[PDB]
Amino acid sequence: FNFNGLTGTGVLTESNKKFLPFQQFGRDIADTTDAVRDPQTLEILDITP
């Protein structure tokens, strides 16, 4: 995938989080990106190895 220039690999899945309007990505304790907001439909997904 390549989401707004951010590249990687994994499995996309529906998510049940509510990003604030000023947020785009979401990290964890390991500091890797776990969720992303689709830049077209504006839905939130979950990235899994």
Binding site: F19, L20, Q23, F25, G26, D28, I29, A35
Partner: peptide, 24 residues
């Protein structure tokens, strides 16, 4: 006059979503 601020004055540092963690 003077007053005491107890724990006021905190804002979001970055624009990244986090949940169920403790950040420094």
């Amino acid at each position: 006059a003077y007053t005491n601020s107890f724990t006021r004055g905190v804002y979001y540092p970055d624009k990244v979503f986090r949940s169920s963690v403790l950040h420094s």
